[PDB]
Design a binder for this molecule. Structure first.
Ligand SMILES: O=C1N=c2cc([N+](=O)[O-])c([N+](=O)[O-])cc2=NC1=O
Ligand SMILES: O=C1N=c2cc([N+](=O)[O-])c([N+](=O)[O-])cc2=NC1=O
Lengths: 258, 259
């Protein structure tokens, strides 16, 4: 009766303990989603086993084979019973799996190295000396691409035609690029990550301006799962008890390095 | 007929009476955020609808003694409406009796003060008495402080609960009025979405200070086992990704602002 919980290895959501070599099972892991999982399980009344998604991805659908990868794939194909991770609620994903109500809110934000004369998305669109880009894939990119707003359309026009490329392969790459471009590059990513990195050494970056949109992380379960109901109520219950905020503050600031 | 009966509440700027509403008939009588949203939801879900205002003008609370729901939530659980399109906060007790779509707007408890008031945060209110402060005498707001584990807020609750004269108001407008009349000696805690709306209305003597003390969400509600929920749920998500929700937000909040 053990529930197979799939999740991704992303800080501070899911991380490896300092001594994960001497540990075994769920005790190996720690972090926001790891703590959350314990709560969700306690209120829904079930035993769970935490497993890291094989390909270490969230969930996208190939345009050719139409196959789902990442944690979404593990849910649609019967490899996992529930996904507890920072998985953003989207239209296409909602069509194939069931999402609970958001346990965390977020949106596209701007990351820059401290000292950079940038304060908003508008500031970027008006200049070029300070290059800026996003992940070469994901909701963040397609946001600007399918945006009928001139500010984001102009930013998109720039990003689309730039030399060298302002797009990055991974997030860690984008963050590093900001730290290494000596204040000549700005990275557009999820606010949750932006404000987490801002609290990590060497603490040479900061979040600027407000969010460009509004997304949400949700606990996903296979379409039609009987588990979805209880889990959904658990999230709402945890939120109304300020537990989600407590968990946030904990892994973002209490364990912060600034 | 196959005309979806849409229940909604009369709260600005979500649903408001037009200019010549007396000369108009049907849905064309109303306007606002939720009115525009309803049109889109119906467009993508493909259905004709009729806008109706909830009789008791309430959102949805379960009377503790009669165990009976009121407002829009009640209209659903008792088969009087097919769908509820309004600023209805997604709560636990409600999710237990109705089906909510994914949030179409995020919000949280915020502090409303009269401009000039020497307050910048909730912690400020808790370290003083010079400036009185309160909330609606019912709802998730007053509920947030009573069951709070944060010291400042539990210190605020201790103050509010035992304060004379009472610092609790009966309506939203009543709380806003008290702020505009207390010459900056009264702060009002309410939904941020409403706080940032009043901040855009005459005479523009109020403002929102500090960040939200929590995080809620407005969602479209439908009765359980409704053949409408899933479609409505996908509609909200798509509208958000197309930036339509943000456009509606900016239209009725800032484009028609007065400050
Ligand atoms: O569901 C998703 N959740 C994500 C969460 C994060 N995150 O910041 O937690 C990131 N990211 O780091 O770029 C990308 C994501 N891509 C997704 O498709
Ligand atoms: O579900 C609710 N939704 C609300 C929405 C608003 N609003 O701001 O739209 C307010 N308010 O104005 O105080 C109170 C509410 N109380 C509720 O119980």
């Amino acid at each position: 009766k053990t529930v197979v919980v799939t999740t991704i290895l992303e800080s501070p959501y899911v991380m490896m303990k300092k001594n994960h070599e001497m540990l075994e099972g769920n005790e190996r892991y720690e972090g926001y989603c790891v703590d959350l999982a314990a709560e969700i399980a306690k209120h829904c009344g079930f035993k769970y086993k935490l497993t890291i998604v094989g390909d270490g991805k969230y969930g996208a659908r190939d345009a050719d084979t139409k196959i789902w990868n990442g944690m979404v794939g593990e849910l649609v194909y019967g490899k996992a019973d529930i996904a507890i991770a920072p998985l953003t609620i989207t239209y296409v994903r909602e069509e194939v799996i069931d999402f609970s109500k958001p346990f965390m809110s977020l949106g596209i934000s701007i990351m820059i190295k401290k000292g950079t004369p940038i304060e908003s998305a508008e500031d970027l669109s008006k200049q070029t000396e300070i290059a800026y880009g996003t992940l070469d894939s994901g909701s963040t990119k397609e946001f600007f691409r399918r945006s009928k707003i001139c500010v984001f359309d102009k930013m998109w026009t720039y990003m689309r035609s730039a030399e060298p490329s302002v797009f990055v392969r991974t997030t860690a790459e984008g963050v590093a690029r900001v730290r290494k471009s000596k204040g000549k590059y700005a990275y557009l990513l999820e606010s949750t990550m932006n404000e987490y990195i801002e609290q990590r050494k060497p603490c040479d970056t900061m979040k600027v301006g407000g969010n460009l949109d509004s997304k949400g992380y949700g606990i996903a379960t296979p379409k039609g799962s009987s588990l979805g109901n209880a889990v959904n109520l658990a999230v709402l219950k945890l939120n109304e008890q300020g537990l989600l905020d407590k968990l946030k503050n904990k892994w973002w600031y209490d364990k912060g390095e600034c």
